[PDB]
Short mmCIF file of C-alpha atoms and ligand atoms in Angstrom, two decimals:
data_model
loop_
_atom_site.label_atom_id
_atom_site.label_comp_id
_atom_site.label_asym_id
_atom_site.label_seq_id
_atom_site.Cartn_x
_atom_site.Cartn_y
_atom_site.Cartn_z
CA UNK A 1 0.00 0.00 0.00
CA UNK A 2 1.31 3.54 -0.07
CA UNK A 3 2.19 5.33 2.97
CA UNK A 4 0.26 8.34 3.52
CA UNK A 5 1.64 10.69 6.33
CA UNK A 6 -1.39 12.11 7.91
CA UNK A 7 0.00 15.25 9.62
CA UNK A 8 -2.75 16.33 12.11
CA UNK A 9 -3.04 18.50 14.75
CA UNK A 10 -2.55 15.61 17.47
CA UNK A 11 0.68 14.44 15.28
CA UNK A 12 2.08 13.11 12.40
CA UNK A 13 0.72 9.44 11.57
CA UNK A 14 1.79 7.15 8.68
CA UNK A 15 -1.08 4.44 7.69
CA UNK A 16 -1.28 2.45 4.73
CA UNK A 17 -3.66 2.96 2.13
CA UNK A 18 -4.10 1.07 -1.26
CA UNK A 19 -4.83 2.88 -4.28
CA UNK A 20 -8.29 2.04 -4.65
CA UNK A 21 -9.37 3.06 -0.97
CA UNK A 22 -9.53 7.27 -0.33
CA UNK A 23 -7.79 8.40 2.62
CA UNK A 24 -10.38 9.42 4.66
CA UNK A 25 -11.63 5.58 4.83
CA UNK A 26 -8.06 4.51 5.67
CA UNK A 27 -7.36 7.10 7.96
CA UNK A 28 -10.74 6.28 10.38
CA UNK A 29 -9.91 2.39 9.65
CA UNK A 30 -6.61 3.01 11.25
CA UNK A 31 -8.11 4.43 14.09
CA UNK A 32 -7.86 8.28 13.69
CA UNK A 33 -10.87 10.45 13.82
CA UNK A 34 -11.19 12.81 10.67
CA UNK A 35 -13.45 15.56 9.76
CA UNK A 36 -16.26 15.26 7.16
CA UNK A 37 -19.93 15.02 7.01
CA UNK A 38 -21.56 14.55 3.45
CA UNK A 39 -18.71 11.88 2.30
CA UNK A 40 -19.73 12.76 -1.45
CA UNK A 41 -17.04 15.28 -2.35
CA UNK A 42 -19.60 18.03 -2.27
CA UNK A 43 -18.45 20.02 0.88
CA UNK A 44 -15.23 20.98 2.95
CA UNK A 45 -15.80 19.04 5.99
CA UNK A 46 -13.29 16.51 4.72
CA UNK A 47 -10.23 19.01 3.46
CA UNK A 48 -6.90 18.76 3.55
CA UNK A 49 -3.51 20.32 2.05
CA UNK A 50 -1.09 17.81 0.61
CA UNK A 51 2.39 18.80 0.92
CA UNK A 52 3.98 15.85 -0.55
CA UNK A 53 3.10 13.04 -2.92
CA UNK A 54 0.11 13.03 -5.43
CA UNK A 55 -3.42 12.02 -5.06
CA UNK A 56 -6.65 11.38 -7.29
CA UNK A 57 -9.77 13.56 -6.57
CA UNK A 58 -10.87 13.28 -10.07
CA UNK A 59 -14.61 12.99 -8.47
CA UNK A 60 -14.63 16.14 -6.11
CA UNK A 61 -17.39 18.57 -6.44
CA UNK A 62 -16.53 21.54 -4.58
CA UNK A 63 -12.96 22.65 -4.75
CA UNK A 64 -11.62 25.06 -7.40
CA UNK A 65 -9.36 25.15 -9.66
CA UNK A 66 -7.02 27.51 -7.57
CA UNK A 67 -7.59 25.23 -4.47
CA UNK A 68 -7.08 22.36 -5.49
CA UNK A 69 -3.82 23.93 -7.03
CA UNK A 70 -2.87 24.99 -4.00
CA UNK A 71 -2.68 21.22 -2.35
CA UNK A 72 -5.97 21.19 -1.32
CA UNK A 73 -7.88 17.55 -1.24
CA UNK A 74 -11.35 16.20 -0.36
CA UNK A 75 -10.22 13.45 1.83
CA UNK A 76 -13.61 11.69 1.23
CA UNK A 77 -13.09 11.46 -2.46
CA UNK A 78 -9.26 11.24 -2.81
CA UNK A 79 -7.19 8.20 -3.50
CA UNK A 80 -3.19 8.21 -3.27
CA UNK A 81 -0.98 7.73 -6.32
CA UNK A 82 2.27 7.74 -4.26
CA UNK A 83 3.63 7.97 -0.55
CA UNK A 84 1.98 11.26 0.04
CA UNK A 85 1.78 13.89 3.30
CA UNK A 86 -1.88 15.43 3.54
CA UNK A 87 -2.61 18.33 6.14
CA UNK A 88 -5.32 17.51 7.84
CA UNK A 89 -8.49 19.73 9.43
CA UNK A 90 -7.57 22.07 7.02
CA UNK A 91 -10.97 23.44 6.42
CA UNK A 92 -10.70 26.87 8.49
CA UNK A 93 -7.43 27.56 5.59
CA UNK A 94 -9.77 27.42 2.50
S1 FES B 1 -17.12 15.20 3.70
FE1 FES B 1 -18.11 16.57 2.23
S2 FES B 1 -16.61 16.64 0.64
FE2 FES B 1 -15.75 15.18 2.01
#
């Protein structure tokens, strides 16, 4: 799986997460306790900033296009494509 460095404001925390599971699923299976509400990529409950490493959010509804330029990633919606780090409760920075 790829590592994904969850850097939140209790610590940083590496879990695994396989390509075809979105980080906010892996993160709460691994036992951490994430923001979100709608889970449908259609809010910011769920955001984060990646600082490292790449991810797929091809299905997000609510970012734009200077946002998500920016780093920032619906959790909910977002699958890795590498080892990435992802910024997390980073709603109050949109
Ligand atoms: S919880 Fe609404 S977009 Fe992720």
């Amino acid at each position: 799986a790829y590592k994904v460095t969850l850097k939140t404001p209790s610590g940083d925390k590496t879990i695994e997460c396989p390509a075809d599971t979105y980080i906010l699923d892996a993160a709460e299976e691994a036992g951490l306790d994430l923001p979100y509400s709608c889970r449908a990529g259609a809010c910011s409950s769920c955001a984060g900033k990646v600082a490292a490493g790449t991810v797929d959010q091809s299905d997000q509804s609510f970012l734009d296009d200077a946002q998500m330029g920016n780093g920032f990633v619906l959790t909910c919606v977002a699958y890795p494509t590498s080892d990435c780090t992802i910024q997390t409760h980073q709603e109050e920075a949109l």
